[PDB]
């Protein structure tokens, strides 16, 4: 896929907080491709002309193998150190698929976390993703 950028050179990305239910108590994290012992929030680059909510849902299907009801935009988060600008949405998961693109292609893993444990495992390498949950 083609990477895209805002006018300031930051990479355009989208991500979703995939909750198990409307109570937003458990969220789905996926393993990192290059470092499978780490967890990240599923998301990725926006394609050219792609709306951010479309990108977010597409990346969650690809990386995490779930579909659901797209909810609110939480916010737009910059990672200054890596020059990323990410739109973060809530998704309420209603469909969990068994054999999804990144599982088959690269052995990506997925796992449910209580919110405070997701924050904990994201903090060391992904502190901006941990901040996605602050509100
Ligand atoms: O190839 P790069 O320019 O170095 O960008 C990489 C790449 O991001 P994109 O391919 O989506 O642009 C990694 O994703 P993969 O290709 O391995 O799946 C991503 O790593 P993770 O998504 O697993 O975290 C990493 O991002 P990060 O450093 O935030 O972990 C990000 O590197 P940059 O930080 O340079 O964009
Ligand atoms: Cl939940």
Domain CATH number, residue 84: 3.90.79.10
Closest CA to 132 of 68, 47, 56: 56
**Number of folded domains in the chain?**
1
In which domain, by residue range, is 111 found? 1-135
Distance between Cα 85 and ligand 1 center (Å): 13
Ligand 1 centroid to residue 74 C-alpha, Å: 22
Residue appearing with tokens 């909810």 = 71
Q: How far is residue 62's CA from residue 43's CA, in Å, rounded to a whole number?
A: 9
Distant-in-sequence, close-in-space partners of 105: CB < 8 Å, separation ≥ 6:
none
Rounded CA-CA distance 82/63 in Å is 21
Give resolution in angstroms: 1.2
Q: Around 25, how many Cα atoms within 13 Å sit in the side-chain half-sphere?
A: 2
Token code pair at residue 14 = 């989208």
CA distance 102 to 99: 9
Experimental method: X-ray
């Amino acid at each position: 896929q083609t990477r895209t950028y805002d006018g300031d050179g930051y990479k355009k990305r989208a991500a979703c907080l995939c909750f198990r239910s409307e109570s937003e108590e458990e969220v789905l994290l996926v393993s990192s491709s290059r470092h499978p012992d780490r967890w990240i929030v599923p998301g990725g680059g926006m394609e050219p002309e792609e709306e951010p909510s479309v990108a977010a849902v597409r990346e969650v299907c690809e990386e995490a193998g779930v579909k659901g009801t797209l909810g609110r935009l939480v916010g737009i988060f910059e990672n200054q150190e890596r020059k990323h600008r990410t739109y973060v949405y809530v998704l309420i998961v209603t469909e969990v698929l068994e054999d999804w693109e990144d599982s088959v292609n690269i052995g990506r893993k997925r796992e449910w976390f209580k919110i405070e444990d997701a924050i904990k495992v994201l903090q060391y390498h992904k502190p901006v993703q941990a901040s996605y949950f602050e509100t």
